[PDB]
Design a protein around this ligand. Structure first.
Ligand SMILES: Nc1ncnc2c1ncn2[C@@H]1O[C@H](COP(=O)(O)OP(=O)(O)OC[C@H]2O[C@@H]([n+]3cccc(C(=O)O)c3)[C@H](O)[C@@H]2O)[C@@H](O)[C@H]1O
Ligand SMILES: Nc1ncnc2c1ncn2[C@@H]1O[C@H](COP(=O)(O)OP(=O)(O)OC[C@H]2O[C@@H]([n+]3cccc(C(=O)O)c3)[C@H](O)[C@@H]2O)[C@@H](O)[C@H]1O
Lengths: 188, 188
């Protein structure tokens, strides 16, 4: 019964397009609970030798403050290693047995779901909720939920690139995160 | 000598994509002055019988507050009628002689510039500054300035549509404007 949405990501940094995704999914699905799920290391992505956790968590909190909804699921941070969603979900479900689970992904992940660890099992444990990225609409199978959002081509990679360049990131991230990135010297 | 940027629009409402445009142009061009230029009636668009001025100006000021730069130019509001850019610019430059004038437009306006009133004269009075809309980059001729922004498919029409149907507009406009629209019962 009780509807729980988890929204997974590197969030390095979280940005305005992540907010649009969270907001649209949350307003459409009206879940009982909404979790931003920051990875320790996102499978299929490269990582630095040192994995920042604290700056990422702080900026996520800033998005929660601005949105007026949400919580952070720290499971993957605590676990460490490669953050396979199957493992996370198996353990999370054990702790939330009376709840229907939703996992929010964009087009880019949806197009490579066959590369996800234990995906045949994972498809049985969550309802994937897919938002359009780099296109204006996404089609999904009946077992999944497609949510159409205004197309906004912002990435975390874009944010880090601009900052290292010395290029402004105003609006692309909320003012709180912009000031935080600047005061902390992130990505410089 | 001093650089003045005017950014023209219906701004009904102003929204997050408009802010991204303003911010990127402002940071790239570093002008001495930046004006949001709300039209009374933008040529080549339909209007209501009653033209709201108060609500639109209030919401533009809210954007200026968030951005930390900019001013409103009320010329077209004061003048009334169809807000032909040629007439506005002719009157504005005689009040700001010795200033280089820049006029910011998106792709959709650039593609129909030939339909603008006295465009052959206008092309001689301002430097058009063109941002990509509904694509990732815009090519322009040497006389104009192309500015690449992250593609963000938000429109004023989208905001009004969502509001009328009772759909959330969170993030698509800043929180101030979101609250203002709902508080004042705009667009429903
Ligand atoms: N502008 C935009 N418009 C619409 N959607 C946007 C977006 N920017 C990011 N997104 C989406 O938001 C999310 C955050 O992006 P980013 O931080 O790059 O995504 P990333 O962290 O690489 O992956 C998102 C989630 O999928 C999980 N995953 C991925 C690959 C394999 C496996 C596995 O277990 O084998 C698990 C990963 O651990 C995380 O929980 C993504 O789902 C992305 O598609
Ligand atoms: N998401 C987005 N990404 C990038 N750009 C975006 C955008 N949304 C709006 N825009 C751009 O921002 C601006 C505001 O949009 P909107 O409010 O629809 O634009 P609109 O008011 O229709 O026109 C923009 C300006 O052009 C002037 N104009 C238009 C047509 C004819 C003539 C004439 O004199 O004959 C003059 C008009 O008076 C105004 O100052 C536009 O330039 C639009 O292209």
């Amino acid at each position: 019964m009780k509807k729980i949405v988890l929204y997974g990501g590197q969030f390095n940094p979280i940005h305005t397009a992540h907010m649009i995704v969270a907001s649209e999914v949350f307003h459409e699905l009206q879940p009982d609970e909404f979790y931003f799920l920051p990875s320790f290391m996102s499978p299929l992505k490269k990582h630095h030798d040192f994995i920042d956790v604290q700056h990422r968590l702080t900026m996520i909190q800033m998005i929660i403050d601005e949105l007026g909804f949400g919580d952070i699921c720290d499971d993957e941070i605590k676990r460490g290693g490669q953050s396979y969603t199957y493992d996370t979900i198996k353990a999370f479900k054990e702790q939330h047995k009376d709840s229907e689970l939703y996992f929010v992904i964009g087009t880019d992940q949806y197009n490579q779901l066959e590369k996800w660890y234990q995906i045949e099992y994972l498809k049985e444990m969550v309802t994937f909720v897919v938002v359009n990225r780099d296109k204006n609409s996404q089609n999904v199978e009946n077992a999944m939920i497609a949510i159409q959002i205004p197309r906004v081509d912002i990435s975390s990679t874009m944010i880090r690139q601009r900052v290292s360049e010395g290029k402004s990131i105003q609006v692309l991230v909320p003012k709180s995160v912009e000031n935080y990135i600047k005061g902390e010297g992130l990505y410089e």
